[PDB]
């Protein structure tokens, strides 16, 4: 069984920059016969189904940007990205088919760093119909911020409130490569109403104080 | 199984990051592999530890 | 269109049986082996083996021996996927793909996901997300989906028309149950101008919910 090396894990990289992932392989991909290195390279992206880029070490399938390039022979392969963009954020994985099991790399992760962006707060108290059920959720959108980390506190009439919160992360946008996060603070009909003051607060590198949303049920 | 995060500082300034996973020996070995397959267009470089050794600095001289 | 349909997702308790299948459309059939690759949930790729699609000889790797089998259905160019026993652990995606002379994969299909787990099919409850003020600018919308099980569910807002600026934000697990919410973020002057709705649907239930946004 031949196993693949990916290097490295995970790459950040600036838009138009030059991109290096590398792929090894514990023992020779090169068929002496036909002379051809049967490793392929191929792109996923979220929730999609692979797609080759690069086979035969170098040859690159028609409609792949010219951008991509494969490189290298017998153990030793390098995908590069001359110029990076957006449409480029994915999971990289190289894959020999020289001797069975195919088998591929665990995978190198490519995402795009950009210029520094504060998140759009936007909260939302529950619904009349959800309400209309027992059931009170406050939701709140933190959108297009980066870097990615960031870190979401509620309050509820001035205390900090922490159970009962569920928070969800979007991967790096493909279009302006920002991140996005949802936060839903879930309380019972009854505890609802024995509050009045709902805050959501936002601590982003981008302030040095916390961005703040807020709504007051008695309005 | 450990990761460490690298800052791969070139001799323009530009500033790219990247991540190994494995044992500390051989994620740190592949930061190391990594930085000589870089430096064959940008230069030599040094590297230096930091986070207890999780974080790295390779700096590449160019030309 | 050269193209492999799978059919849609499974809900299977462990123990039991599912059969996927992959219908080739636009090529001959028996002029390629198909493969299956398989992913677990925020894992790699890892090959399953393949079929001769003329014969029907299967190849197995290792780690798929025993519990899964690969049958066609020459007749009808489609090829088949059946796991047996199935376990907590074979919860994941499975892919069939189309395999070159130049040994790799150019056609896949869009893959099946196989949820192995005991829980209850539960329909989703979804609440609109009006704002609170009415300022005048960008305008952020949304939509809560909770309460379902199993997973997926599509979101679209204005059936697909209104795709820019959205964020539909990946499920969160708590007691056998999702809950998923996706906002839309639109110009002041569309809204409420215009119509904002989001199209919720959760096939495991047949439950397809429009809900419209009301100041």
């Known amino acids: 069984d031949i196993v693949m090396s990916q290097s490295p894990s995970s790459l950040a990289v600036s838009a138009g920059e030059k991109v290096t992932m590398s792929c090894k392989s514990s023992?020779?991909?090169?068929?002496?016969?036909?002379?051809?290195?049967?490793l392929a390279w191929y792109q996923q992206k979220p929730g999609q189904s692979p797609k080759v880029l690069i086979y035969?070490?170098?040859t690159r399938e028609s409609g792949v940007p010219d951008r991509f390039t494969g490189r290298g022979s017998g153990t030793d392969f390098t995908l590069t990205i001359s110029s990076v963009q957006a449409e480029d954020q994915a999971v990289y994985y190289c894959?020999?088919?020289?001797?069975?099991?195919?088998?591929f790399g665990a995978g190198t992760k490519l995402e795009l760093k950009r210029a520094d962006a504060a998140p759009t707060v936007s909260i939302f108290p529950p619904s009349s119909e959800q309400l209309t059920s027992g059931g009170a959720s406050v939701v709140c959108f933190l959108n297009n911020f980066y870097p990615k980390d960031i870190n979401v506190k509620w309050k509820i009439d001035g205390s900090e409130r922490q159970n009962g919160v569920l928070n969800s992360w979007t991967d790096q946008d493909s279009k302006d490569s920002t991140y996005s996060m949802s936060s839903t603070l879930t309380l019972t009909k009854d505890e609802y109403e024995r509050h009045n003051s709902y805050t959501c607060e936002a601590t982003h590198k981008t302030s040095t104080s916390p961005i703040v949303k807020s709504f007051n049920r008695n309005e | 199984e450990v990761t460490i995060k690298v800052n791969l500082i070139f001799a323009d300034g530009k500033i790219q990051t990247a991540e190994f996973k494995g044992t500390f020996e051989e994620a740190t070995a592949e930061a190391y592999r990594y930085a000589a397959l870089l430096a064959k267009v940008n230069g030599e470089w040094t590297a230096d530890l930091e986070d207890g050794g999780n974080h790295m600095n390779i700096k590449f001289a160019g030309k | 269109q050269i193209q492999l349909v799978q059919s849609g997702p499974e809900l299977k308790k462990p123990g039991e049986t599912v059969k996927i299948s992959c219908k080739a459309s636009?090529?001959?059939?028996?002029?390629?082996?198909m493969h299956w690759v398989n992913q677990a949930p925020g894992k790699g790729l890892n090959w399953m083996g393949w079929?001769?699609?003329?014969?029907?000889?299967?190849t197995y790797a290792d780690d798929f021996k025993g519990r899964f089998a690969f049958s066609l259905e020459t007749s009808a160019s489609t090829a088949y996927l059946q796991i047996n026993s199935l376990k907590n652990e074979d919860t994941a995606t499975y892919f069939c793909?189309?395999?070159?002379?130049?040994?790799?994969?150019?056609?896949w299909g869009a893959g099946t996901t196989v949820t192995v787990s005991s829980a209850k099919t539960t329909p989703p409850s979804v609440y609109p997300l009006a704002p609170g003020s009415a300022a005048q600018s960008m305008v952020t919308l949304g939509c809560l989906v909770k309460g379902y099980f199993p997973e997926p569910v599509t979101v679209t807002w204005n059936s697909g028309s209104l795709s820019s600026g959205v964020h539909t934000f990946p499920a969160v697990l708590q007691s056998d149950l999702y809950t998923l919410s996706s906002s839309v973020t639109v110009p002041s002057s569309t809204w409420p101008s215009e119509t904002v709705t989001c199209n919720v649907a959760h096939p495991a239930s047949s439950t397809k919910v429009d809900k419209k946004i009301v100041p």
């Open positions: 894959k020999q088919a020289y001797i069975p099991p195919l088998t």
């Open positions: 079929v001769n699609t003329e014969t029907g000889e299967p």
């Open positions: 793909a189309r395999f070159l002379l130049r040994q790799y994969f150019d056609v």
């Open positions: 636009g090529y001959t059939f028996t002029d390629f082996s």
């Open positions: 023992q020779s991909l090169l068929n002496s016969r036909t002379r051809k290195n049967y």
């Open positions: 035969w070490a170098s």
